[PDB]
TrEMBL record, chain B:
This is Hsf. The gene is hsf. Residues 93-129 form the Autotransporter adhesin NhhA Trp-ring domain. The chain holds residues 1608 to 1744 of 2413 of the full protein. It is found in: Cell outer membrane; Cell surface. Signal peptide: none annotated. Residues 13-80 form the Trimeric autotransporter adhesin tryptophan-ring motif domain.
């Protein structure tokens, strides 16, 4: 009887006999991959390790990770929670706006901010000008 | 022959002999975790159940879920589709999820101009309207 | 002696034998593909049955209801192609995905000011330029 896996990356089955005889244990585990991220954009281990060098510290085990294995709930959740779109900050680079981050469209000098949300969920942002007298 | 699993959270293997005498069935399954969300931010079961109290009803089974198990496609899809960034509503916050249309329109004495570069980068610019 | 799986969609266990005496047991994990359209994530069946325009979905993915597990690449590719749409005046709509730079620039008689607080909260304000 042989025990082989469908996909070597998703499922890992190893048979050992660490009892020096007659006791054959079959270890069945799920190989999981880690999801990385940078500048609000999700990256794999190999991509982030090979393409980016600045400000990032990637381990050797994560460096060889090409993201072909499965993922847990926590990994996905944290990945999305660290992912989003970047906005240009004036004072002159970029700031990462992830999911759940509050963005307030306020009014300033001689302007009137009007941000509305329809029942369909569609967002309409509009600025007005006030000219009296 | 022994049948043990690598990780108890990702994989669950149970050996039983309930199917009558001499018939020993080995059930091998993958333990999956559920993904929750609130205000466009993804939370685990335990996180959503324990941190937030208002307007939310989380079951006891989901309350103990720490998200150490695997996840299915539909769960991830719905989670992302219920996740996004919040905007201040002037009338108090509104959740902007994936795929929802955000229209930058112009109003009184203003001119909306939203352009899309080849890089995919969006440039939003407002103008003032002074004719004659 | 039976080898059965808990969920047929998440886990697949098959016992096979080509001639006599060699019985191999293949255990693999059935994975589902995550699709997307207009920045919104869809399953295989949903995209295939509900959407007709501009999209070509295979039959194997057409029956996919997204009940199986997912790999890292699938999730990563799915999220990075998902996001929120903005009205472009050229018009129509434009899909803004994750990691995409959105610059609030100033124009005629306007002054753009986008600031980021310590909380990470973004405050965008427009000013008027009257010299």
């Amino acid at each position: 009887m042989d025990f082989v896996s469908g996909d070597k990356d998703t499922t890992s089955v190893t048979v050992e006999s660490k009892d020096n005889g007659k006791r054959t244990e079959v270890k069945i585990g799920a190989k999981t991959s880690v999801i990385k991220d940078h500048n609000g954009k999700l990256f794999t281990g190999k991509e982030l390790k090979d393409a980016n060098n600045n400000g990032v510290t990637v381990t050797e085990t994560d460096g060889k990770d090409e993201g072909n294995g499965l993922v847990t709930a926590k990994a996905v959740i944290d990945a999305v929670n660290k992912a989003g779109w970047r906005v240009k900050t004036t004072g002159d680079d970029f700031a990462t706006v992830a999911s759940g981050t509050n963005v307030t469209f306020a009014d300033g000098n001689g302007t009137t901010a009007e941000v509305t949300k329809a029942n369909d969920g569609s967002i309409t942002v509009k600025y007005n000008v006030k000219v009296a007298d």
